[PDB]
């Protein structure tokens, strides 16, 4: 029935292919260490930066990677057989609690069962506490369901070092000044205020949860958007020609070729800059194509001086990476500069051999190599009537950066087997189109983070001074989330590019080794992307 | 032909006599009621730089690419961002630099 | 918009109506809303130019960083609008027009 | 509002004015009104949003 | 002052429902110079128009 | 409470705390504590009420 | 410094040839002639900006 | 230009895949990508009429 | 239900605002 | 912090009205000390007096 020596639950595993779902089930074994001894301690982070968080006596699930849910052959399946899913609804289990006590009663140290020890669960389905997971974490589900999962440690970000720098000292209260202003208003959250599970190895506890987002499209464009039209009708219509260079000039109009017909469609946005390459040597500086600094309007980050035609504090850009957040990638629709933005491991703590993967295939023609602006003639206008010419003129330019503008159709980027699924969209009031570079899909209200801690037990002191007892926690979690499918239909004639093992490079590929290093790609093609075969007519 | 012509020409001129409305007097009242629909007015503030909340505790999967010999030869060597410092998906809102004329 | 380095730019405005005495300007000055940024820079590569041969030592000297003024309306841009004061209008008429984007 | 936060927030007091007599009216019945923008109560003070 | 420092300090956001305006007790008066003074006598039967 | 009160009220917001720090953990753990009155907040602030 | 006269000259004003979307824009599209096409296929891409 | 099949238009869109090389192309190195010169783009890319 | 190995309660906090 | 930051400045007075308290997740724990090192180990079967 129930008790200590019963189970609360079994390994599940596996996946269902269906029509109009699919259900990926994956069960791993996790354990829980006492993180930061109980306690909430400042985290500052050494070397040169002025972010400045909580650090927390506590430790989350996080599900959010596609490789963690899907298998290699159920990554494939998917993508060449479905034109689109999103999730649907996720479940998730955790049984089969096990708290274990440390003790070293020599200098060996021997491992004993301590029932009556009670494990915390709190599921934030509400996000009243920092969501401070992150796309892109090394922290998730393992890919492989045999390897032992350790939860990480939960920190969150609480005020910016050189937002409280100048002027906060404490002996009497500055109300004007804006940076003490922004260290008082500053929060501080503590997981113990809310309502949460304490469960010990009889007991256990499931979440359920209904995913509200988009689709990720796994079909490409075989045209470019403005090449879709048919040659063998004439246009109706006229490109201008300036004629004589001068004033007395007009425009003279001729048909343009039935193979070249103007477009309504505009690329997609981007933004041409590529990042700093610079070979610094700092790794907490900001090297990211747009770095932000936010500062309030009274307020001196790091070395701040005054424009003096606004006379508002302002940074040099050299400063600013100090006081700085890059965002990466910018380039959304362009994908000439796939890549630059993304660059990632899939390795975990592996110091083995870095892997690098970076994604280069993108074969998707709705996504632009370059644009290209062109504003009149190519030699300046004589400002008197008749005569020749003028001096020489740029007629043609690069346009580097394209900001949002109407008639804009683009596709995201492919992504590969192992990327975050989703990314918490902000809490703001106004947000822009979502379109994200790493092709995540942000929700209002993602899955809430499970945090987990163990119990504090107390040891008597005669110093009264705090003692806890050194123990964790085991268990088994069970992740069932439901996918939304869509099998692709199409009168194409010729065969599609399937995401065959043949392209890839290296032979031995997600299999153990002699020692039992599971191999993983270290190539974006051999990740299996998106958007490979399917083709969509534009 | 003339466009200028043409704008004064198709100029509107508007008189409030031509509508339907109420006179009264002083022994008269009267009311009128209106549904809004419309945004909200958010009193709270954000404490976080968009791109500033994560996790320092864990370490990030991304790399940043880094030129290595300044010439032709060269390629893009990468490394691991600091767990203090991690790229962010979420552009700044809009706005224009421009503060406007003073010149006296 | 959402720059709040700004703010102290474009609002001032006086409450007192029709009074000679004093014009009591006030200005927007305070927002701790770190969702509005102070500034941003782009990046957009090494600092120094390349070399056109191979092997060969850098080149000219380049402009790595620089600040971006103006900044349009983009994919994944999350902000928040002005904080407002007492005496501020409560709305405002949008126009009759076909088209229109985001409202701030 | 509803909130997890621990500390406590910044809630626009009279306290942060620069002048103590205001939204009253004066010896001659004049109605002395704010010149700043603090002094003018905005919003977006204190109450925390979590990202 | 307080209505509105006792809004922004309890409350997360706001927007209106609905608005109820009332015009009433209305009033016509002639303004008359009888001399060189000039006196405010209350005129009945004159009207006011009123247009949403 | 409700007032007819014109002029607005005393809140006990943070603004007037002469620590910046306070209520919040430091770098070792220690929870910071208000040391003077004012800072825990007092009752009777600016609640005003008809004699 | 503090005092002096100005400085170099400097450009107060310019032309902006390039106005990309931005927040509170509103405008109207094209009049249209009798013969103009009637639509256009919107095409069968995941992401579209507004429409003009 | 009498050339009526080249791109005449406000914005010429050059769609090329990252490893693809477009009619005569070169490595930006500064990001090391294909790219093309403005006036051999023409021949690869499709402009878009009217922007205005 | 009842034992050794079942907790007797859970873990509650926070607080409820109201008129 | 915050609850009584709240408490004081939206309300003009309280008292409590009933209290709750309840007494769970008990643990006894035992200490022996079987060398020079103190272990704790879990006793069952070892009660707690609870008086009000």
Same mark, same amino acid.
């Given at each position: 029935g129930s008790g200590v020596g019963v189970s609360?639950?079994?390994?599940?595993?596996?996946?269902?292919?269906?029509?109009? &779902?699919? =259900?990926?089930?994956?069960? &791993?074994?996790?354990?829980?260490? =006492?993180?930061?001894?109980? &306690?909430?301690?400042?985290?500052?982070?050494?070397?040169?930066?002025?972010?400045?968080?909580?650090?927390?006596?506590?430790?989350?699930?996080?599900?959010?990677?596609?490789?963690?849910?899907?298998?290699?052959?159920?990554?494939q399946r998917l993508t060449n057989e479905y034109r689109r899913w999103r999730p649907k609804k996720m479940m998730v289990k955790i049984y089969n609690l096990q708290?274990? !006590?440390?003790?070293?009663?020599?200098?060996?140290? *021997?491992?004993?069962?301590?029932?009556?020890?009670?494990?915390? =669960?709190?599921?934030?389905?509400?996000?009243?506490?920092?969501?401070? !997971?992150?796309?892109?974490?090394?922290?998730?589900?393992?890919?492989?369901?045999?390897?032992?999962?350790?939860?990480?440690?939960?920190?969150?970000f609480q005020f910016q070092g050189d937002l409280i720098d100048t002027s906060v000292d404490g002996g009497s209260?500055?109300?004007?000044?804006?940076?003490?202003?922004?260290?008082? /208003?500053?929060?501080?959250?503590?997981?113990?205020?809310?309502?949460?599970?304490?469960?010990?190895?009889?007991?256990?506890?499931?979440?359920?949860?209904?995913?509200?987002?988009?689709?990720?499209?796994?079909? &490409?464009?075989?045209?470019?958007?403005?090449?879709?039209?048919?040659?063998?009708?004439?246009?109706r219509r006229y490109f201008a020609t300036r004629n004589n260079y001068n004033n007395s000039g007009k425009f003279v109009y001729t048909r343009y070729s039935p193979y070249n017909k103007? /477009?309504?469609?505009?690329?997609?946005?981007?933004?041409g800059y590529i990042g700093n390459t610079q070979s610094a040597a700092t790794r907490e500086q900001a090297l990211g194509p747009v770095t932000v600094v936010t500062a309030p309007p009274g307020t001196s980050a790091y070395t701040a001086f005054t424009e003096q035609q606004s006379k508002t504090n302002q940074q040099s850009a050299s400063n600013a990476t100090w006081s700085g957040y890059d965002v990466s990638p910018v380039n959304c629709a362009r994908s000439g500069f796939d890549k630059i933005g993304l660059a990632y491991d899939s390795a975990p703590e592996s110091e083995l051999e870095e892997k690098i993967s970076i994604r280069d295939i993108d074969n998707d023609m709705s996504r632009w190599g370059q644009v290209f602006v062109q504003d009149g003639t190519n030699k300046e206008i004589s400002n008197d009537n008749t005569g020749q010419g003028g001096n020489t003129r740029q007629n043609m330019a690069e346009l580097k950066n394209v900001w949002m503008f109407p008639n804009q159709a683009w596709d995201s980027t492919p992504i590969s087997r192992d990327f975050p699924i989703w990314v918490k969209s902000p809490?703001?009031?106004?947000?822009? *189109?979502?379109? /994200?570079?790493?092709?995540?899909?942000?929700? /209002?209200?993602?899955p809430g983070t499970i945090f987990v801690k163990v119990a504090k037990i107390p040891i008597p002191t005669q110093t009264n001074t705090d003692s806890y007892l050194t123990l964790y926690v085991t268990g088994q979690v069970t992740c069932t989330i439901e996918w939304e499918v869509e099998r692709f239909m199409t009168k194409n004639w010729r065969p599609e590019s399937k995401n065959d093992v043949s392209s890839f490079r290296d032979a031995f590929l997600y299999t153990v080794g002699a020692d039992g290093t599971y191999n993983t790609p270290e190539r974006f093609l051999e990740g299996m992307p998106t958007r490979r075969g399917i083709n969509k007519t534009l």
């Open positions: 609360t639950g079994g390994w599940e595993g596996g996946t269902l292919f269906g029509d109009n &779902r699919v =259900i990926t089930v994956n069960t &791993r074994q996790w354990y829980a260490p =006492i993180y930061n001894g109980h &306690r909430y301690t400042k985290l500052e982070g050494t070397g040169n930066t002025f972010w400045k968080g909580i650090k927390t006596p506590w430790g989350y699930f996080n599900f959010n990677a596609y490789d963690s849910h899907f298998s290699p052959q159920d990554w708290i274990k !006590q440390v003790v070293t009663l020599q200098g060996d140290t *021997l491992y004993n069962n301590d029932l009556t020890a009670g494990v915390h =669960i709190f599921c934030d389905g509400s996000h009243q506490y920092p969501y401070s !997971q992150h796309p892109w974490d090394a922290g998730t589900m393992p890919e492989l369901p045999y390897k032992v999962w350790l939860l990480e440690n939960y920190g969150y209260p500055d109300v004007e000044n804006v940076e003490k202003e922004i260290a008082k /208003s500053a929060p501080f959250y503590i997981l113990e205020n809310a309502n949460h599970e304490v469960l010990r190895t009889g007991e256990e506890t499931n979440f359920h949860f209904n995913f509200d987002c988009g689709w990720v499209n796994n079909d &490409r464009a075989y045209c470019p958007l403005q090449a879709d039209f048919n040659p063998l009708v004439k246009t103007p /477009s309504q469609w505009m690329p997609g946005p981007s933004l809490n703001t009031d106004k947000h822009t *189109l979502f379109d /994200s570079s790493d092709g995540t899909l942000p929700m /209002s209200h993602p």
